[model samples]
Target: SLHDFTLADVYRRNAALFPDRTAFMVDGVRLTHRDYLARAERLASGLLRDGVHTGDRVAILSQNCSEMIELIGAVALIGAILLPVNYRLNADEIAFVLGDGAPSVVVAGTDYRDIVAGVLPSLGGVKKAYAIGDGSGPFAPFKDLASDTPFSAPEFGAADGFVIIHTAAGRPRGALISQGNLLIAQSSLVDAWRLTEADVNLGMLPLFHVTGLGLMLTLQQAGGASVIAAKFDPAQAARDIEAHKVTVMAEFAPMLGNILDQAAPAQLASLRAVTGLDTPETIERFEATCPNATFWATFGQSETSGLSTFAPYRDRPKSAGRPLFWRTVAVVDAEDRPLPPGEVGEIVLRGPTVFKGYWNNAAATQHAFRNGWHHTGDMGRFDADGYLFYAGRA
Candidate 1:
């Protein structure tokens, strides 16, 4: 039961509960829940002033930063979809997404002002371009937007779209993820990981990706803190764990191996879950090196919120673990018929966590949701015990 609760609603509860707790740490700055929420409300008010109404798109171009973190809440707080452009993309690639999303406002980090400037003239729908740094160019300064007043966030429903996250779908395409998609996806991992308010997570992954964005919401849900990094650095990540005593870290095979190569045991003594996977050989080697932590497995995509399945503490090893609590996952034959255990077929998902459909592609959406199921191109089979196993893509 979504009960009309939004991501902003969940965050408000956490802010109330952990008023003084450390919520975010980016660069050298720290923000308490009270501070973060206050700033988000201000930004939401500012968004309203800039003509961004419910369902309007607000594009964000930046690397990982405190402002991005704030906008994650701010945009949703105002019932507008936050479109995060992948900063690593070339100008053409970025322009394609901007033109597709047609955001009313484009807010960019200082490093990306040049690229944003180059792309702005091409986007006729974008009413305003604000730069985070001091600039007298056509783009307005970002600080001028921070208001002292509070924002009465607009009314919306569970099915209302909250974010438009782009991914590699033929060309870069947007998935109009709903508030329900995010909450269900976020709470599933929060349940599996046993996340708590005291946990301090290392937010090293790029926030634009599904994993990183989901992890950020999971942290916010638990009222925990995220010691975010601009990018992953083995040496710096090791220092982050010790500096923040990070309890929850989103682990991936290649990155874990990298961290283990440089970090001493003491540097990672506080880690509780240092391994997550792709069946890489580094797991065994890493376990022996950092025994304090455990491992996990996950199978998901941006179109399906974040994760469809998560194996907690390496439970059901070699499997994608169970379907998320709120999700109904099935192995289906070519025509979308349900398959019994051990029968390989496409992975079909239906639940609150699943996205409504592609942002603007009606034909694609109809094909994807043919027969009332979100047809994941991924193929998998389930064991008798109900653990899903990967079987590559269609």
Candidate 2:
């Protein structure tokens, strides 16, 4: 029932709907839709002038910040791919992704300046590196590339290649997320959560993962505002919620633990909803800390574009919720046959959100997709109400 469109198209429509609404915020600086779109156009034109073309990989080596969000918007407008590197990675690990992905341009943050500089000499295919903050280093400043000249947005189809690479946590090889994968993820989330313009999201997730990327796109699509944190800090997060009056916040398991440990009751009272990777203990702690806040949990992977099953805040069960309407999830045996209700097996998904395949890794892709289903590599079962109970990895 949901209509399909490119990520850029969705963003453009939202910009038209609410040109004056806030789109992004970092360290108290806010960029509204009109202002952000203007910056996006300028960055797009700048990238084009620098020889960036459609399907070209544009890697970002940064922590969470406004410039990073702008870069993603610029990449979408120019029809280029975005590769968000994990800032926690060392020089060698960073070099591997750079060499493998072969980005045309690298945008390094101030925090990773030294590490990126050390790895730059090893990345032979990278043509340029633009320092995003403070405009330091051998590269040019990202802000200086802004142009007022009007330029047409790049053309892209629903299934056109968008974001290309995502490094799996603790894995040597990274997963490749497609435009289709991102679109499916967005549609599923929007429909299931009923995200709208009224939502003021607390952006605390790391930008390197699908959680951050999906939240950014979904909030933008709804013409909503997002209060971004440079990094996940419990005390700072608590202050941000009270100061900004955030309606929605996403937290990973560990993040919730830290937040509840340090956050005051008054600070927790400001949020309307908190969605993220959850466990039984984490959920219990969340209830204890923010009794008034709604809690939503999900079951997903980077390959599945972040979420497969989501428990809405209002109807959260002890387990993760049912699959979204657009998605089909099943617990299957070794032979890939679907297991009946209450039967435990590997959780497989067949849907639009599924990744096309791992980038340039035919063997891995083949092994991952068998019999038209994406073997999630996670183990789980379904209850009578069709809610998913995550056990562990397969």
Candidate 3:
């Protein structure tokens, strides 16, 4: 019945419910639910010592790892916001995000020291830098932050901003995502996919992206285990699915093609369903190769917090599915008036999963909420059969 949290204690509640079960796996490291919470608590305590209080921004620049998973809970427990910077972006792009978010501390992987150093001078608000692996040079070790001091989870409601994901497609602005948004999306995903605690998800997408955040958190919220690969290796992923017996998976449009190319039919035999932004070619390839796995087409952006639509390949798979159960979607003209069915216009959405707003930019935020709806910039129209036909963005 929790659409949002009384305290947003998803990690804590799941830990108590499934202490003995494995929660997250990265590289050679595997953490049970209990271990995951302990590490997150310790890190939350350490964050307090470092002067990271409620509403403070904590920026992380790393690939998918156990630390990223822990920090998702640690920072949220303190009511702080997580700024996940895309590591692939150039130094200038990285600096823009850091500057925009104004995070006091920045966390990085050992391999990114050079990139961090280059952007350090540009981020005047940054007071500390910590490296995950060795913590060489002036950076502190990530493990050292795990203190024994107890941390109490904060009671966060619908209005509290939990994460700031930078969007550069239209403008480089931080999408201020809220705790309520994630919870709503999680509820929608777990229910729609029919996920259970017995499920194991393949964490192949970058955690910085909403795609990864949505499924990973959905599995976690569902009390399921997540097997994280630092990067996607089509061959390795096929083996991972077979080895770990991943029940559910998520990926890019072309990833199914890559998996089909590298993996044997037997390797992907255990998969129940795969989710992605699939095209006719990709869907054709997966069905031809991995016949057992069902394809679920998902559509959303950081502003929507997670997936707003899920269309299984089985039902009217050609469309983008109906508007998600929790939200309202409309195709609006330039004046924001709803267009007639079958008429193409900008897709506007409103729901619990919608973002809080663009961080620290009222002008952009106002423009986004024009006509009392989140103008999704993407163009689409609804058919008479209750299907959304995505008609490409401007």
Model 2 lDDT tens row, 290-353: 7777787688877888888887644656777888766799999999999999999999998788
Model 1 lDDT per residue over 27-107, tens place: 998899989888889988988888888999989898998888888888888888889989888989999888888899998
* Worst ten in a row by lDDT for model 1: 274-283
Clashing pairs in 2: none
In every candidate, how many clashes are there? 0, 0, 0
Measured by lDDT, the strongest candidate is 1
Off by over 4 Å in 2: 1-4, 134-136, 169-171, 288-291, 313-316
Candidate 3: tens digits of C-alpha lDDT, residues 270-314: 888888787878886787776767787667888887777777766
TM-score of 3: 0.95
Q: Which ranges of candidate 3 are over 4 A from the true structure?
A: 1-8
From the highest TM-score down, the ranking of the candidates is 1, 3, 2
In model 1, which regions exceed 4 Å deviation? 274-276
Candidate 1 vs candidate 3, lDDT winner:
1
As a whole number from 0 to 100, the lDDT of residue 369 in candidate 3 is 96
Q: After superposition, how far is residue 308 of candidate 3 from its true place, in Å?
A: 1.2
**Cα-based lDDT for every prediction:** 0.83, 0.78, 0.82
